[PDB]
Design an enzyme around this catalytic site. Structure first.
Site, PDB file in Angstrom:
ATOM      1  N   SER A 143       0.855  -1.199   0.000  1.00 35.83           N
ATOM      2  CA  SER A 143       0.000   0.000   0.000  1.00 35.83           C
ATOM      3  C   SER A 143       0.897   1.257   0.000  1.00 35.83           C
ATOM      4  CB  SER A 143      -0.882   0.021   1.268  1.00 35.83           C
ATOM      5  OG  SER A 143      -1.970  -0.868   1.188  1.00 35.83           O
TER       6      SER A 143
ATOM      7  N   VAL B 111     -14.825   5.340   6.297  1.00 27.60           N
ATOM      8  CA  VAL B 111     -15.126   6.773   6.059  1.00 27.60           C
ATOM      9  C   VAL B 111     -16.497   7.066   5.447  1.00 27.60           C
ATOM     10  CG1 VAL B 111     -12.663   7.288   5.920  1.00 27.60           C
ATOM     11  CG2 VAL B 111     -14.028   6.981   3.786  1.00 27.60           C
TER      12      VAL B 111
ATOM     13  N   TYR C 221     -10.212   5.081 -15.931  1.00 23.01           N
ATOM     14  CA  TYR C 221     -10.141   5.764 -14.650  1.00 23.01           C
ATOM     15  C   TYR C 221     -11.498   6.422 -14.406  1.00 23.01           C
ATOM     16  CZ  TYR C 221      -7.764   7.702 -10.529  1.00 23.01           C
ATOM     17  OH  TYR C 221      -7.358   7.975  -9.286  1.00 23.01           O
TER      18      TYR C 221
ATOM     19  N   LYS D  71     -11.120  12.549  -8.035  1.00 30.87           N
ATOM     20  CA  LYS D  71      -9.801  13.144  -7.762  1.00 30.87           C
ATOM     21  C   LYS D  71      -9.712  14.655  -8.048  1.00 30.87           C
ATOM     22  CE  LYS D  71      -7.469   9.478  -6.186  1.00 30.87           C
ATOM     23  NZ  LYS D  71      -7.210   9.270  -4.723  1.00 30.87           N
TER      24      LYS D  71
ATOM     25  N   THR E 271      -0.493  -1.786  -6.450  1.00 28.42           N
ATOM     26  CA  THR E 271      -1.035  -2.012  -5.078  1.00 28.42           C
ATOM     27  C   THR E 271      -2.218  -2.931  -5.192  1.00 28.42           C
ATOM     28  OG1 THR E 271      -2.502  -0.098  -5.348  1.00 28.42           O
ATOM     29  CG2 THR E 271      -0.334   0.247  -4.310  1.00 28.42           C
TER      30      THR E 271
HETATM   31  N1  LIG Z   1      -1.411   2.657  -6.600  1.00 26.49           N
HETATM   32  C1  LIG Z   1      -1.412   3.706  -7.501  1.00 26.49           C
HETATM   33  O1  LIG Z   1      -0.932   3.572  -8.630  1.00 26.49           O
HETATM   34  C2  LIG Z   1      -1.920   5.073  -7.163  1.00 26.49           C
HETATM   35  C3  LIG Z   1      -1.469   6.181  -7.902  1.00 26.49           C
HETATM   36  C4  LIG Z   1      -1.913   7.460  -7.564  1.00 26.49           C
HETATM   37  C5  LIG Z   1      -2.809   7.641  -6.511  1.00 26.49           C
HETATM   38  N2  LIG Z   1      -3.239   6.542  -5.827  1.00 26.49           N
HETATM   39  C6  LIG Z   1      -4.110   6.852  -4.675  1.00 26.49           C
HETATM   40  O2  LIG Z   1      -3.393   6.386  -3.547  1.00 26.49           O
HETATM   41  C7  LIG Z   1      -4.303   6.097  -2.472  1.00 26.49           C
HETATM   42  C8  LIG Z   1      -3.875   4.731  -1.920  1.00 26.49           C
HETATM   43  O3  LIG Z   1      -4.306   3.622  -2.693  1.00 26.49           O
HETATM   44  P1  LIG Z   1      -3.230   2.449  -2.975  1.00 26.49           P
HETATM   45  O4  LIG Z   1      -2.926   2.359  -4.462  1.00 26.49           O
HETATM   46  O5  LIG Z   1      -2.214   2.483  -1.948  1.00 26.49           O
HETATM   47  O6  LIG Z   1      -4.228   1.210  -2.801  1.00 26.49           O
HETATM   48  P2  LIG Z   1      -4.512   0.277  -1.546  1.00 26.49           P
HETATM   49  O7  LIG Z   1      -5.394  -0.819  -1.979  1.00 26.49           O
HETATM   50  O8  LIG Z   1      -3.259  -0.181  -0.905  1.00 26.49           O
HETATM   51  O9  LIG Z   1      -5.281   1.273  -0.598  1.00 26.49           O
HETATM   52  C9  LIG Z   1      -6.596   1.739  -0.780  1.00 26.49           C
HETATM   53  C10 LIG Z   1      -7.080   1.889   0.633  1.00 26.49           C
HETATM   54  O10 LIG Z   1      -8.351   2.546   0.614  1.00 26.49           O
HETATM   55  C11 LIG Z   1      -9.023   2.111   1.748  1.00 26.49           C
HETATM   56  N3  LIG Z   1     -10.468   2.317   1.686  1.00 26.49           N
HETATM   57  C12 LIG Z   1     -11.338   2.026   0.700  1.00 26.49           C
HETATM   58  N4  LIG Z   1     -12.638   2.283   1.098  1.00 26.49           N
HETATM   59  C13 LIG Z   1     -12.591   2.726   2.358  1.00 26.49           C
HETATM   60  C14 LIG Z   1     -13.580   3.150   3.380  1.00 26.49           C
HETATM   61  N5  LIG Z   1     -14.892   3.185   3.089  1.00 26.49           N
HETATM   62  N6  LIG Z   1     -13.068   3.536   4.556  1.00 26.49           N
HETATM   63  C15 LIG Z   1     -11.766   3.524   4.863  1.00 26.49           C
HETATM   64  N7  LIG Z   1     -10.803   3.138   3.952  1.00 26.49           N
HETATM   65  C16 LIG Z   1     -11.181   2.730   2.742  1.00 26.49           C
HETATM   66  C17 LIG Z   1      -8.791   0.615   1.587  1.00 26.49           C
HETATM   67  O11 LIG Z   1      -9.142  -0.218   2.699  1.00 26.49           O
HETATM   68  C18 LIG Z   1      -7.322   0.549   1.308  1.00 26.49           C
HETATM   69  O12 LIG Z   1      -6.627   0.524   2.546  1.00 26.49           O
HETATM   70  C19 LIG Z   1      -5.696   6.138  -3.107  1.00 26.49           C
HETATM   71  O13 LIG Z   1      -6.294   7.436  -2.953  1.00 26.49           O
HETATM   72  C20 LIG Z   1      -5.337   5.997  -4.581  1.00 26.49           C
HETATM   73  O14 LIG Z   1      -6.326   6.589  -5.401  1.00 26.49           O
HETATM   74  C21 LIG Z   1      -2.807   5.301  -6.103  1.00 26.49           C
HETATM   75  O1  LIG Z   2      -6.258   6.077  -7.865  1.00 25.30           O
HETATM   76  C1  LIG Z   2      -5.494   5.143  -8.382  1.00 25.30           C
HETATM   77  C2  LIG Z   2      -4.708   5.330  -9.521  1.00 25.30           C
HETATM   78  C3  LIG Z   2      -3.969   4.244  -9.951  1.00 25.30           C
HETATM   79 CL1  LIG Z   2      -3.022   4.349 -11.455  1.00 25.30          CL
HETATM   80  C4  LIG Z   2      -4.049   2.950  -9.358  1.00 25.30           C
HETATM   81  C5  LIG Z   2      -4.799   2.762  -8.189  1.00 25.30           C
HETATM   82  C6  LIG Z   2      -5.575   3.820  -7.727  1.00 25.30           C
HETATM   83  O2  LIG Z   2      -6.346   3.705  -6.585  1.00 25.30           O
HETATM   84  C7  LIG Z   2      -7.575   3.202  -6.743  1.00 25.30           C
HETATM   85  C8  LIG Z   2      -8.150   2.945  -7.973  1.00 25.30           C
HETATM   86  C9  LIG Z   2      -9.429   2.394  -8.019  1.00 25.30           C
HETATM   87  C10 LIG Z   2     -10.076   2.141  -6.796  1.00 25.30           C
HETATM   88 CL2  LIG Z   2     -11.675   1.410  -6.814  1.00 25.30          CL
HETATM   89  C11 LIG Z   2      -9.578   2.427  -5.543  1.00 25.30           C
HETATM   90  C12 LIG Z   2      -8.296   2.960  -5.485  1.00 25.30           C
HETATM   91 CL3  LIG Z   2      -7.537   3.284  -3.938  1.00 25.30          CL
END
Ligand SMILES: NC(=O)c1ccc[n+]([C@@H]2O[C@H](COP(=O)([O-])OP(=O)(O)OC[C@H]3O[C@@H](n4cnc5c(N)ncnc54)[C@H](O)[C@@H]3O)[C@@H](O)[C@H]2O)c1
Ligand SMILES: Oc1cc(Cl)ccc1Oc1ccc(Cl)cc1Cl
Length: 260
Positions: free
Chosen positions: A19, A65, A157, A164, A195
């Protein structure tokens, strides 16, 4: 015990050691921070308990949340342990799976729109409100995570790009509201990282490959790089910085198309 010695941060969003929130935990802990953690549901409780223990923390609270009461109660429980908080990290996103698979116009229904905004954008503002007394105590900061699909269209997306964009406008509105109290509010816009949530967006492998081929540094970014940037924005070295969206994407967002 070296940039964040004596400081305390709550981390919402750890699902696995992959994560983003876990790489952020790791970086803050490495520089001396003491940590607390939230979990979204019973099944995740057991995993977050173990992860917290790994950072030397017994501070673990339910926070779905979607529920006002759980947000409020999480910070109420936290204040039984900490008399102030140096920072809250919001690393949480969700949209129903069907909204992210297919044509945007056809698949973005009202409830799917509602849930994506509620979980991925509203929740940051709700967490900031609930955290305000504890942040005021230490002039603490807020940090959230965003993705460039807010500003340019990314395949599948979809409504997450709308949510976002809403979250990023929230970062600015929060910064203006809380800045008078010395509370800084920023976001990191991360490049694609593998992730648990990433599995589940069908275009993710294509995004990850594009970022590797096109980004100026010609490689993908890591949770260590995202964690380190998060550490900076949560530290006194970032005391002049608020309302900012910091790109941590190896420069991808700066390129219009690579050389072929
Ligand atoms: N992985 C990527 O490529 C990427 C890139 C840019 C931004 N993000 C953003 O990074 C953040 C982290 O996501 P990640 O990729 O680490 O994925 P992740 O799966 O590790 O984390 C997503 C988290 O969101 C939490 N979540 C979802 N619904 C929820 C609720 N109702 N209450 C509390 N928590 C809740 C989940 O339990 C999980 O812990 C997110 O906002 C994602 O959009 C991810
Ligand atoms: O925002 C993100 C952007 C990227 Cl490239 C990869 C994972 C991401 O994170 C999510 C994407 C879809 C859902 Cl349902 C929940 C989350 Cl946390």
């Amino acid at each position: 015990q070296g940039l964040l010695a004596g400081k305390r941060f709550l981390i919402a969003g750890v699902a696995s050691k992959l994560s983003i929130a876990y790489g952020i935990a790791q970086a803050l802990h490495r520089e001396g921070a003491e940590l607390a953690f939230t979990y979204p549901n019973e099944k995740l409780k057991k995993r977050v308990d173990e992860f917290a223990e790994q950072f030397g923390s017994k501070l673990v609270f339910p926070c779905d949340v979607a529920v006002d009461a759980e947000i409020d109660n999480a910070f109420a429980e936290l204040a039984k342990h900490w008399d102030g908080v140096d920072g809250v990290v919001h690393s949480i996103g969700f949209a129903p799976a069907h909204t992210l698979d297919g044509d945007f116009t056809d698949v973005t229904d009202r409830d799917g729109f509602k849930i994506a905004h509620d979980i991925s954008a509203y929740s940051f503002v709700a967490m900031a409100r609930a955290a305000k007394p504890l942040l005021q105590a230490r002039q603490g900061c807020l940090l959230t995570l965003t993705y460039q699909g807010s500003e340019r269209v990314m395949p599948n997306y979809n409504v997450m790009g709308m949510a976002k964009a809403s979250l990023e406008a929230g970062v600015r509105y929060l910064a203006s509201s809380l800045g008078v109290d010395g509370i800084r509010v920023n976001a990191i816009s991360a490049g694609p990282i593998r992730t648990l949530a990433a599995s589940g967006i069908k275009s993710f492998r294509k995004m990850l490959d594009a970022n590797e081929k096109v980004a100026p540094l010609k490689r993908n970014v890591t949770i260590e790089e995202v964690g380190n940037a998060a550490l900076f924005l949560c530290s006194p070295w970032a005391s002049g910085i608020t309302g900012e969206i910091l790109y941590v994407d190896a420069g991808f967002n700066t390129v219009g198309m690579s050389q072929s």
